[PDB]
Design a binder for these strands. Structure first.
Ligand SMILES: O=c1ccc2ncc(F)c3c2n1C[C@@]3(O)CN1CCC(NCc2cc3c(cn2)OCCO3)CC1
Ligand SMILES: [Mn+2]
Ligand SMILES: [Mn+2]
Ligand SMILES: [Mn+2]
Ligand SMILES: [Mn+2]
Lengths: 671, 674
DNA sequence: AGCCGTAGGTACACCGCAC
DNA sequence: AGCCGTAGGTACACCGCACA
């Protein structure tokens, strides 16, 4: 019994608060009136009774507890006269996931306790916004704002149209995705309460948020918010590859407070993935300690592990503090975070992405960096280049885990339409092992296949006699010798027939279903290969142009400051007189401007100069910096005057990155 | 569960026992899977010396080890059935790891003795400088620790059976006193092949016992803190998380303390901070919390992602003058940070907030006190070092719990203050009142210190259900933010309510005793102290802190005067100063020329070069003269203080008195006599 | 039918001492 | 007994989509 009941046993005047868990529950319990206010803390996202089978709804803990608590029974054994509270209040947290949970609770109430809604017994609390959850609020401010009958504003759930309600719960919570997807495309925007309205607004609120700020990557830098924030945090704390490894608990703590208002496990595990050479084609995090295995083992707890950027991540961040990309307010207006990273290499395609969102998902495979940039260079020289033509550069996916791809037709379809099915195979050979016996040796497995689960799958077949010919199965994999899975073949059995069966019946062959959905200008979009590169190139141009414009403004400010110091150096004797005959700093300022026709800034810079700056070498430093800066100023203006020069520079910086980080193709494309 | 090897030839097969999956992950990635099995355990294992058999055989990890080894236990042990000829204990390289090792060896000795006698039990030797094996890369762990070509495993040898029996009895057994005795005789408060089991258990257990005694479970007498709380407060100070500054995220606080100062689990840090923010736990709260921070009904805090914290105004006094060389700093656990050995502690925190701790061989239980009373005691002591405990009791009347209530009698308090030990009877505040129709009720508005309210309610509800008390018709917790604590016991019409109340005191936590046991760290050793010793040590701390501060401010003032003498010379002769700089090509030359030509020290010459041109304005020459004159008065004031001990002691009195007037409050707990 | 990866959520074993 | 408070350790419920 999680239920913290009230004293009074008079249902007319008793109410029950459904909260997300004990973090909310505590604040709730501390602030309530225990005479008339019961509390039932749940455990987060409840079951979707619209998608779930009947037997499993009834065997579900929180469903049981809610029913037990209400005292009515369910569906047809629902007696409204046995109800123990005339007020059932949904008080989930005031975030998108709170709205989602409320829709899930409503789905449950409408399907199994419909008459409870019809009796006007179901209510929605209205906690203040700007709180991640109720546990973040003090007890008194939760009582006054949300729970005190004297000041609270509860919304009574009313049911208007029964037909229309049915169509709503089926559409939003039902198993058919397309209908949901259609609702989101049609409706997306980039103190009674109608149940139909609440469902539609709450779900859209959740759907949208998961679509544009959680599960789908941005086309420009290929990142989800969590990754973008982990990387930015690493940048902000000077956690570069030349520095030592920093503790993960601080990385996580920092990202969670400043940028990512969600649980630590989502953050830590997203970071861990980026450090794994079998998950990321070009790892983004350089980890120290236990960071997981291909066998599905998780990483060590965050208190043990350490991390920093890889050298390549520096290229994601290069020039972020040179006004290249737009910054936005963080979740609470106390911080600033990047909307997008500079992304000086085409990361989306390089590393790919997979996200399960709402009404849609995404699945992009990784690619070879040498080939992608070559692709970008060709597009840059011909805006009208066909997909076929791009594919002379980018042969197909290139998986961190190597392996084989069967044929080109799936790739082609996927590059042209954004969708397509790519068959992946393990790299396997047949060899002798003595006495006329043979074995199969696997040294590379498909992308995202759990090796230990794959081995168990084979063993299970052996055992069930669903496959013939295998006498032994060993995972000889080693840190020192790499992946090595050995399948011994029964004497005189065709091992090639056995190998073929394994590809038919086990993850030893696996398909990658490409479904290339990314955020293009804030909206989810199914894109082909060209579109993906087009948006990327366009982003590289804005980055380098904005960088060049930044460096200019700053060069011009510094030259202006140096012009002041040189005037000063030229008339040093007269500059001293002016300052020495002045009572206050303000008087000296005004006099320096008047005597030598200096700006307010130049005068300040002169007054701030130390006596040290009068030594021979220091005087020469000022002159030397000034001459170097004039040459730099025109170098910048030249680039700004000519579009082709700019684009050329985007080409030369991409090339430089290709030469330094480009590497061999790993996945073999068999015809 | 077990991650077994390929081969089933036990002669060449080995099993590694690690503390959990963090360690096991690195171990499984680095191992030779042909001959090396891994059994990850789950932290501290059951101590079999203290447990009966039914408890042992139902412990999951014991069972998994038994099943893994395949030999059976006790009388049914069969060495021939061993699945591995090397059992390797490879716990983390920290004191808790040493402790887990001692627990496993205890188990092996009592249940698998022949396993040790055949030389099948080994101890791995992972490098130190790592919290757990999860901190290591799989290759580093293989090469230094598991690889048979470079590793240095320690084979456990049983030399003398009689002596090992006694060793397992003493160190792991239930008679605490012998363990305490063992620690006292051996505590110093300053490997290739074989390893005698007895030595291993002695050195490993002492290492853990010592570490828990001096650096975990016991408070320091000077500032009244344990390492975790000290590092929390220091953390809050270092990031300027003061009362006037906004609330800071708990996750940020904890991650920082965990990273730089306290190399342990997040739980221990957060939950410690949480307690410091609880007005029913701390007589004077050290942390100011925003969000769900728990309750007297035992509700924990909200998860740390939700809560935010900062220091209280009174914690600033714990930290006052910490950056004025008042206390000794030490290296952190890894050498990358500095941390304070002790806080200046400008109020008697040990006694004010109290402490309770379970250590090894000993424990501690010190109740909290009223700050006004404590300071007046301290002041009385400072004017009479020959003051008796009884006379000190005219200032300090007894403990004063954050939860208020009543204390029964003074004799318990007296014994506690005289000896360091004593039982103090604590009672709830309860009244009897009418409720209508000739019926009465008991109403409890205050409960004993460290009693969980809801649990006390459940124990009363249990009594009535079991009919081991009569006259109670109803029981409600009416506690509210508006009302305060209010527990109601409705009595049956015409039943004597006082007799019921009296039974409730005897049969439930409604009256609890506080077993005073005043053990604190004095000069880094655990010591049982009385009330006078606690004050005396605290006052000597204060005298040291104020003395060191005054010495610091004097070195600081004397340095500044010396700079200003060089700035006066410079400004007087500024034209010559400028020409000297201009004619100098480097700083090195400019330094050298200013020092000779103007009779300046290296520090003064540097100060002049660092001087900005704005510093040459007309009214600066006077501003510098005024500062220098005032520094000479200041230096004279400070020397006057260091010259006379009584002026220093008075200075301590004055600051303590100021603390009292600002932070001192009324007594909460009533001491009823008889 | 189960798994991929970002999300909401919480529980329970063990050590130590003392009364 | 089992509870006070620093320590070691880790697991399992839920949503959402698409593909075998
Ligand atoms: O292993 C198990 C097995 C079963 C189980 N059943 C229930 C339950 F609740 C739990 C369970 N657990 C663990 C757990 O306690 C849940 N954990 C609570 C603490 C969370 N991390 C705290 C944290 C640490 C930080 C930080 C932010 N947050 O920021 C930087 C500094 O370090 C992680 C999840
Ligand atoms: Mn929530
Ligand atoms: Mn450990
Ligand atoms: Mn009692
Ligand atoms: Mn017992």
């Amino acid at each position: 019994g999680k239920l913290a009941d009230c004293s009074s046993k008079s249902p007319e005047e008793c109410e029950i608060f459904l909260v997300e868990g004990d973090s909310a529950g505590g604040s709730t319990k501390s602030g309530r009136d225990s005479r008339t206010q019961a509390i039932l803390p749940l455990r987060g996202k409840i079951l979707n009774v619209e998608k779930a089978r009947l037997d499993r709804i009834l065997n579900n803990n929180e469903i049981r507890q809610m029913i037990t608590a209400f005292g009515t029974g369910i569906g047809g054994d629902f007696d409204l006269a046995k109800a123990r509270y005339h007020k059932i209040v949904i008080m989930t947290d005031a975030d998108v996931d709170g709205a989602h949970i409320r829709t899930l609770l409503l789905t449950f109430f409408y399907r199994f306790m419909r008459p409870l809604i019809e009796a006007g017994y179901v209510y929605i609390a209205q906690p203040p916004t700007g709180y991640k959850g109720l546990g973040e609020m003090n007890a008194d401010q939760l009582w006054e704002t949300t729970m005190n009958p004297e000041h609270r504003a509860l919304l009574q759930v009313k049911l208007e149209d029964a037909i229309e309600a049915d169509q709503t719960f089926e559409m939003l919570m039902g198993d058919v995705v397309e209908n949901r997807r259609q609702f989101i495309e049609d409706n997306a925007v980039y103190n009674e309460r109608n149940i139909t309205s609440e469902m539609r607004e709450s779900f859209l609120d959740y759907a949208m948020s998961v679509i544009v700020a959680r599960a789908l990557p941005d086309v420009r830098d290929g990142l989800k918010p969590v990754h973008r924030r982990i990387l930015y945090g690493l940048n902000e704390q000077g956690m570069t590859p030349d520095k030592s490894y920093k503790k993960s608990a601080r990385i996580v703590g920092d990202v969670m407070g400043k940028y990512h208002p969600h649980g630590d496990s989502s953050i830590y595990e997203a970071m861990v993935r980026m450090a794994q050479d079998f998950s990321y084609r070009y790892p983004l995090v350089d980890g120290q300690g236990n960071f997981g295995s291909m066998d599905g083992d998780g990483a060590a707890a965050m208190r043990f592990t350490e991390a920093r950027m890889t050298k390549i991540t520096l290229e994601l961040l290069r020039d972020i503090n040179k006004d290249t990309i737009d910054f936005i307010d963080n979740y609470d207006g106390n911080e600033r975070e990047p909307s997008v990273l500079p992304a000086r290499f085409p990361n989306l395609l390089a590393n790919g992405a997979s996200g399960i969102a709402v009404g849609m998902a995404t699945n992009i495979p990784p690619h070879n960096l040498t080939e992608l940039i070559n692709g970008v260079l060709s597009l840059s020289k011909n805006p009208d280049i066909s997909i076929a033509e791009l594919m002379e550069d980018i042969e197909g996916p290139d998986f961190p885990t190597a392996g084989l791809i069967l044929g080109k037709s799936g790739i082609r379809r996927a590059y042209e339409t954004g969708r397509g099915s790519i068959q992946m195979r393990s790299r396997a050979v047949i060899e002798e092992r003595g006495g006329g016996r043979q074995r199969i040796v696997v040294t590379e497995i498909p992308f995202q296949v759990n090796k230990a689960r794959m081995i168990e799958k084979i063993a299970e077949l052996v055992r069930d006699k669903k496959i013939d010919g295998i006498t032994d199965l060993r995972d000889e994999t080693s840190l020192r010798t790499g992946v090595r899975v050995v399948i011994d073949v029964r004497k005189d059995a065709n091992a090639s027939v056995i190998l073929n069966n394994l590809y038919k019946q086990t993850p030893l062959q696996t398909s990658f279903g490409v479904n290339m959905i990314a955020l293009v200008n804030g909206r989810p979009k199914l894109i082909n290969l060209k579109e993906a590169l087009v948006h990327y190139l366009e982003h590289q141009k804005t980055v380098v142009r904005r960088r060049t414009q930044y460096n200019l403004r700053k060069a011009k400010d510094r030259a202006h400051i140096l012009e002041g110091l040189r005037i000063a150096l030229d008339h040093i004797d007269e500059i001293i007189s002016t300052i020495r005959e002045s009572d206050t700093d303000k008087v000296a300022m005004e006099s320096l401007q008047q005597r030598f026709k200096l700006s307010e800034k130049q005068a300040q810079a002169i007054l701030d100069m130390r006596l040290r700056r009068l030594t021979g070498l220091e005087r020469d430093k000022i002159e030397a910096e000034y001459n170097e800066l004039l040459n730099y100023i025109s170098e910048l203006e030249t680039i700004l005057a000519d579009e082709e020069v700019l684009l050329q520079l985007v080409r030369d910086e991409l090339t430089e990155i290709r030469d330094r980080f480009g590497d061999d193709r790993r996945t073999e494309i068999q015809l």
